Amino acid sequence: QVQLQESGGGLVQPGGSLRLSCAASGFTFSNYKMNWVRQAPGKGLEWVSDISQSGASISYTGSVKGRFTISRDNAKNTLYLQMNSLKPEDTAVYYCARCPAPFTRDCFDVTSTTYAYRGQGTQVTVSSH
Amino acid sequence: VMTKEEQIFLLHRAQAQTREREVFDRLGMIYTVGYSVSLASLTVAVLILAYFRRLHCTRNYIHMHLFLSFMLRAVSIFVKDAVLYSAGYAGCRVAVTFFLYFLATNYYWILVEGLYLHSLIFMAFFSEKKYLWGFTVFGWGLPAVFVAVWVSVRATLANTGCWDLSSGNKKWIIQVPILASIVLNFILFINIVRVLATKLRETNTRQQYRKLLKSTLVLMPLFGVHYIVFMATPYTEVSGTLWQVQMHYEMLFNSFQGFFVAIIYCFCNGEVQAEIKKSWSRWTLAL
Amino acid sequence: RVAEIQLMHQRAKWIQDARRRAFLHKLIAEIH
Amino acid sequence: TASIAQARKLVEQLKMEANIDRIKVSKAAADLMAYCEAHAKEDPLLTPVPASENPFR
Amino acid sequence: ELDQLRQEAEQLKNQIRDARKACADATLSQITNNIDPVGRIQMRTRRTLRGHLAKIYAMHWGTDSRLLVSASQDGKLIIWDSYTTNKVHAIPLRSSWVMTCAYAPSGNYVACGGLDNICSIYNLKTREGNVRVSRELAGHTGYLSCCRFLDDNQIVTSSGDTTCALWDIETGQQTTTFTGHTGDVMSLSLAPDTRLFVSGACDASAKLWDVREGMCRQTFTGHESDINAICFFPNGNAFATGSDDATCRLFDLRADQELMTYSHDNIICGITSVSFSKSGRLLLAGYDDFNCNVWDALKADRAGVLAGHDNRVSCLGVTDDGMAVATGSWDSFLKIWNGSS
Amino acid sequence: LSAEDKAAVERSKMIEKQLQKDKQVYRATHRLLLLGADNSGKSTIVKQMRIYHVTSGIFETKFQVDKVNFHMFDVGAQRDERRKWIQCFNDVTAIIFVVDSSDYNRLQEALNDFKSIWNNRWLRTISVILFLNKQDLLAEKVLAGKSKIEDYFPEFARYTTPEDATPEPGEDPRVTRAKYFIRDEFLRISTASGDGRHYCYPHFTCSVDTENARRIFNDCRDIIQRMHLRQYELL
């Protein structure tokens, strides 16, 4: 069964650093493109960044370009998202999404409301106390 | 002129009592070789096109008709060469009539190719393709008319000796309709290139120009551009640089036009190559 | 100008002229 | 929201699926093999029929 | 509250996995090594059904193995006489985006549906002899992906709204509703006794449902991508599923786990249709690489290759008597393949 | 030949001629697929093109331009997931993708949707008629100055107006700069892949002008021309 386990999150001071880890099982990690999708409170799912099978092509959205780093380890089947210089608006539930078909470049509906091939996600809240 | 000098010369006398043939043979040899190669390539192309049902299309139907016209022209030229070289026999006139008819059909089928392309680019917008049937009437029916009338004129005006010898301006009954196909189609070619360039200008980069050059080259044999090189030339003696260059150009290019078209539009066609590769793969796997 | 038809007419005229010249040369051989 | 109801329904479905009389995989594989062997002679695709009885001449 | 429910569900899934591992003493490949291999199967085309204006999306065989119904995305539903290649019927469709078609076991009704979300059922034995829209079924909020007749009065239809429904023809209402899939349901397969049916969705899972009751019985998650086709085994105790992961999987209703996996390194394209012959020894699967592969159900090897379609194979069917195999494709041509001795 | 077989052959011939007439009708008509987000003005465009003419699942609108019939199909009651049914539109004449130019926050979602449509395996041979809808709203938002595109897209800071731009004579330079930035953002994705097998036609639509359908007609013509140019290998 396809399942993704996310770790990393919680309260983080603004301007700090954080790391999100995704563990994949039940499928060949090396044959699918990986995406990160965040859902802010009061808003819908939005695409953040994506990395291909071999990591040759890496893309980010406009809001996080130059700030987040996405990497993958095929041997460990682990997806890493290093976020630095966080903002209060960046608080959201983060999920990892998999391409519906292998050897496919277009992630057609990885941002769907009830997309099956995604993990439970983790809360990332950027607040100052 | 002819061997009727006997009458006048003998009557008057009793009352008072190699380079040219070498050039002709060289031209005959070169155009025979070119037309034989073109005929072989075009019959191979016809067999290939008729083999695969995927290739069956209106464009390929027009291409098949053009190839058949070229093959018939080559066969008629060979038959005329056999009959005339090495006398008002009926078969002798029939061979020349068939040669002229097949030449006219080849020219008008080149014109039909040009007209079909122009209609596809300008006139065939969101419409049916029934006009192909009309093109068939244009392909064979129209050349058969003005030639046959000419034959009737040739049967009613002089009817002396073989018809391969000019007997005034009656040959223009056949030449003038052909020359128009030489001119008008050429104009269409230019127009196509223009809009082709526009298409490139609408898609973009210097490489576009390069593509246009290629888009010109493969377009040249189909439209018969080389004719316009020597279309406007009056009668000339069998000697001189102009006549020799004109013959060595026209005969060679006309002989090799069918070969070039068969290579470009059938042998080098992407769909035909893909079909050949698929058929070869299926045959190898099955065997 | 159609090259094929022009060449055919020129060759027919050349054949007729060659026949006439051959007859003239055969006759002038006996006459001269 | 309906997340709690959906989770409860999923748990109930998993409980229903857990209480089933499962059997050994070897027995199922043997049954499939026996079924394939028994009807092997009745499969025209597996054993081609002569063209005389074939309606696709 | 949600966390406790999720933990309980995870514990139940782990218990089910442990039970499946415990009951999996041996695999099919281990004990099928002693059977004679089928060998290189060769088939030839006997008929070529042409006349569709656009791509063929689905087809279904009748119980007589002579009349076959095919649907094209140009708005046409053609019923052909397979033996004599004649077109028995040509029904125009109000919606031109039909994705599936079904032939009634009695042959008096033909059903179709698609992006219009309406199941249109047409008669073939009218008093005047002209076909017309007998009934229209509405209620699905997603595209109609598959439909199959159980009798002349009830029809099972799967839609893209992750829902299946048993409809009554006489009343035109959903008699039964089957829910539980998270992804769009792509196909369904009726059991020989028609009491149960299996449905595959885009969530890499297949579910077994009781027609008379209406709850899911068994769930399978062997595949890693969307399941595009599913077909019941002839004995009714197993089924096969094809997915976009270029791998077919055989699941047993008793073992409750995958038994055999069919895949190859040279195959990387998706799987569109799957069907078993009468014996169940051969599994025919259509692929996106313009050819169909026939695999040995026990040996899991490429027994045969059928390469006679210009475009991707969209549908495949096997007659009840198993005399020939019909394969549709997007190249508007329906090829009938048969073997020769 | 048997009498029953002869009758079957006769009815088959009748069905064949009916199918020939149906094919003649079908070839003349051109099928188009309408796509866009909820905020996009798809409904207004459909209503205008219906009134001017020059549960449900899918909606069909038939309009005639220069004696050419076009059937535009709009997605009705369907789920958010669309990776499966979109394959049904692999042979449509064109895809009219309408984008709300005044939605900055959801502009990235529109870009991702356009990229997915362009890079789809079964949609590689289908051209897209891109409509940047709601130009007046975008102009008003730019003139207001409360919201800046630089926050959503930092690269807009270094962006410059193309030399080939042809703005309206009475148009604010910032408005045309922003609209051409959006157009170039779409065109970069469009030219990122395709290898010339299909093309994109960006247009600026006000959701009320009557010329839009005409534009589509023109675009269709171009596609047809290019299709023929792809048959002769001239491109």
Which H or E element spans position E231? strand E227-232
Nearest by Cα to E38 from E281, E321, E341: E281
Say if E136 is an interface residue toward chain B (CB within 8 Å): no
Q: How far apart, in whole angstroms, are the C-alpha atoms of residue E157 and residue E72? A: 19
Q: Which residue in the block uniquely carries the two structure tokens 């449905």?
A: E199
Q: How far apart, in whole angstroms, are the C-alpha atoms of residue E34 and residue E219? A: 31
Domain of A64, CATH number, reads 2.60.40.10
Retrieve residue A106's tokens: 């277009």
Q: What three-state secondary structure class fits F106?
A: coil
Among F30, F199, F228, beta carbon nearest to B203: F199
- Cβ burial, residue D50 (10 Å; 0-12/13-18/19+): exposed
Nearest by Cα to D13 from E224, F234, E205: E205
Say if C30 is an interface residue toward chain B (CB within 8 Å): no
DSSP bridge partners of E157: E147, E165
Other beta carbons less than 10 A from residue B83's beta carbon? 18
Other beta carbons less than 10 A from residue A13's beta carbon? 11
Other beta carbons less than 10 A from residue E21's beta carbon? 10
**Measured between alpha carbons, how far is residue E211 from residues D19, E176, E191, E229, E242 in Å?**
20, 8, 10, 20, 23
Q: How far apart, in whole angstroms, are the C-alpha atoms of residue A31 and residue A36? A: 17
Residues of E in contact with B54 (CB under 8 A): 310
Q: How far apart, in whole angstroms, are the C-alpha atoms of residue E158 and residue F222? A: 40
AA letter at A64: V
Is there an interface between C and B (3+ Cβ pairs < 8 A)?
yes
Q: How far apart, in whole angstroms, are the C-alpha atoms of residue E134 and residue E136? A: 7
Which H or E element spans position E17? helix E2-23
- CB within 8 Å of E292: residues ≥ 6 apart: E284, E285, E286, E305, E306, E307, E309, E313, E316, E327
| Domains by residue range for chain D, with CATH | 4-56 (4.10.260.10)
Q: How far apart, in whole angstroms, are the C-alpha atoms of residue E49 and residue B124? A: 30
Nearest by Cα to B109 from B257, B241, B278: B257
Nearest by Cα to E182 from B236, B32, A109: A109
Number of domains in chain A: 1
Q: What is the DSSP string of A53-117?
A: SSSS-EEE-TTTTTTEEEEEETTTTEEEEEEES--GGG-EEEEEEE-SSTT-----STT-TT-SS
Q: Which residue in the block uniquely carries the two structure tokens 């159609």?
A: C2
Domain of B254, CATH number, reads 1.20.1070.10
CA angle F22, F27, F29 (to 5 degrees): 100
- Cβ burial, residue B281 (10 Å; 0-12/13-18/19+): exposed
Flag if F121 and A104 touch (Cβ within 8 Å).
Answer: yes
Q: Which of F78, F81, F88, F156 to mutate to test the interface with A (most CBs of A within 10 A)?
A: F81
Retrieve residue A13's tokens: 């001071």
Q: What is the DSSP string of F136-169?
A: HHHHHHHHH-SS-HHHH-GGGTT----TT----T
Q: How far apart, in whole angstroms, are the C-alpha atoms of residue E339 and residue D54? A: 10
Which H or E element spans position F17? helix F3-28
CB of E188 within 8 A of CB of E196?
Answer: no
Resolution in A: 2.6
Method of elucidation? cryo-EM
Other beta carbons less than 10 A from residue E264's beta carbon? 13
Q: How far apart, in whole angstroms, are the C-alpha atoms of residue E57 and residue E59? A: 7
Retrieve residue A3's tokens: 């399942």
Q: What three-state secondary structure class fits B104?
A: helix
Gap positions in chain F, given as the residue before each gap (C–N > 2.5 A)? 54
Nearest by Cα to F95 from F76, F112, F70, F64: F70
DSSP state of F119: T
Retrieve residue C2's tokens: 């159609």
Q: Which residues of F148-165 are buried (b: 16+ CB within 10 A; e: fewer)?
A: ebeebbeebeebebeeee
Range of the domain at A67: 3-124
Strands across the sheet with E67-72, in order? E56-61, E67-72, E76-81, E87-92
Say if B270 is an interface residue toward chain F (CB within 8 Å): yes
Nearest by Cα to F181 from F167, F199, F200, F195: F167
Nearest by Cα to E327 from E118, E119, E36, E56: E56
Q: What three-state secondary structure class fits F170?
A: coil
Q: How far is C7 from chain B (nearest CA, A)?
A: 8
- Rounded to the nearest angstrom, the gap between the alpha carbon of residue E136 and the centroid of all alpha carbons in its chain is 22
DSSP bridge partners of E305: E293
Taken as a whole, chain C contains a residue count of 32
Q: Is residue A129 included in any domain, yes or no?
A: no
- CB within 8 Å of B272: residues ≥ 6 apart: B48, B49, B52, B55, B266
Residues of D in contact with E83 (CB under 8 A): 55-56
Q: How far apart, in whole angstroms, are the C-alpha atoms of residue E173 and residue E204? A: 30
Strand F128-133, strand F203-204: pairing:
parallel
AA letter at B185: N
Q: How far apart, in whole angstroms, are the C-alpha atoms of residue A57 and residue F103? A: 27
CA angle D27, D32, D35 (to 5 degrees): 125
Q: How far apart, in whole angstroms, are the C-alpha atoms of residue A9 and residue A38? A: 12
Nearest by Cα to B73 from B261, B283, B276: B261
Q: What is the 3-state secondary structure (H, E, C) of chain C?
A: CCHHHHHHHHHHHHHHHHHHHHHHHHHHHHHC
Retrieve residue F109's tokens: 């979602």
Q: What three-state secondary structure class fits E102?
A: strand
Q: What three-state secondary structure class fits E257?
A: coil
- Cβ burial, residue C16 (10 Å; 0-12/13-18/19+): middle
**Measured between alpha carbons, how far is residue F229 from residues B89, E73, F196, F225, F234 in Å?**
50, 26, 12, 6, 5
- Cβ burial, residue B218 (10 Å; 0-12/13-18/19+): middle
Chain A 23-82, CB below 8 Å of chain F: which residues?
Answer: 46-47, 61-63, 65-66
Flag if B175 and C1 touch (Cβ within 8 Å).
Answer: yes
Say if F56 is an interface residue toward chain E (CB within 8 Å): yes
Q: What is the DSSP string of B183-249?
A: HHHHHHHHHHHHHHHHHHHTT--THHHHHHHHHHHTHHHHHTTTHHHHSS-----S-SHHHHHHHHH
DSSP bridge partners of B43: none
Say if C26 is an interface residue toward chain B (CB within 8 Å): no
Q: Is residue A30 included in any domain, yes or no?
A: yes
Which H or E element spans position B12? helix B5-15
AA letter at E145: S
Among F79, F120, F152, beta carbon nearest to A108: F120
Q: How far apart, in whole angstroms, are the C-alpha atoms of residue E249 and residue E239? A: 9
E38-339: CATH architecture: 7 Propeller (2.130)
Range of the domain at B81: 19-286
**Measured between alpha carbons, how far is residue E239 from residues B82, D36, E59, E325, F70 in Å?**
74, 14, 20, 18, 44
Flag if B125 and F68 touch (Cβ within 8 Å).
Answer: yes
Strand F94-100, strand F30-36: pairing:
parallel
Retrieve residue E119's tokens: 């199941």
**Chains touching chain B at 3 or more Cβ pairs under 8 angstroms?**
C, E, F
Q: How far apart, in whole angstroms, are the C-alpha atoms of residue B236 and residue E24? A: 97
Of all residues in chain F, the one with the smallest CA distance to E163 is F79
Nearest by Cα to E99 from A19, F114, F87, A70: F87
AA letter at A124: V
Q: How far is D1 from chain E (nearest CA, A)?
A: 11
Angle between helices F107-118 and F173-192 (to 10 degrees): 30
- CB within 8 Å of F24: residues ≥ 6 apart: B128
Taken as a whole, chain F contains a residue count of 235
Q: How far apart, in whole angstroms, are the C-alpha atoms of residue B138 and residue B185? A: 14
Q: How far apart, in whole angstroms, are the C-alpha atoms of residue E322 and residue E306? A: 17
DSSP state of E38: -
Residues of F in contact with A114 (CB under 8 A): 80-81
Q: Is residue B148 included in any domain, yes or no?
A: yes
Which H or E element spans position B36? helix B19-51
Q: Which residue in the block uniquely carries the two structure tokens 């122009």?
A: B118
- The domain locations on chain E are 38-339
Flag if E81 and F90 touch (Cβ within 8 Å).
Answer: no
Q: Which fold has domain F29-231?
A: Rossmann fold (3.40.50)
Q: How far apart, in whole angstroms, are the C-alpha atoms of residue B150 and residue B147? A: 5
Q: How far apart, in whole angstroms, are the C-alpha atoms of residue B183 and residue B189? A: 10
Q: How far apart, in whole angstroms, are the C-alpha atoms of residue B280 and residue E56? A: 27
Nearest by Cα to D53 from A32, B261, E310, E321: E321
CB of B253 within 8 A of CB of B226?
Answer: yes
CB of D28 within 8 A of CB of E319?
Answer: no
Retrieve residue B77's tokens: 């030229």
- CB within 8 Å of F226: residues ≥ 6 apart: B199, F199, F235
AA letter at E114: G
Q: Which of E29, E46, E232, E281 to mutate to test the interface with D (most CBs of D within 10 A)?
A: E281
Number of domains in chain B: 1
Q: Which residues of B248-262 are buried (b: 16+ CB within 10 A; e: fewer)?
A: eebbbbbbbbbbbbb
AA letter at A125: T
**Measured between alpha carbons, how far is residue F95 from residues B218, E27, F90 in Å?**
33, 49, 10
CB of E276 within 8 A of CB of D39?
Answer: no
Q: Which residues of B173-201 are buried (b: 16+ CB within 10 A; e: fewer)?
A: bbbebbbebbeebbebbeebbebbbebbe
Retrieve residue F60's tokens: 């069909």
Flag if E324 and D18 touch (Cβ within 8 Å).
Answer: no
Say if E5 is an interface residue toward chain B (CB within 8 Å): no
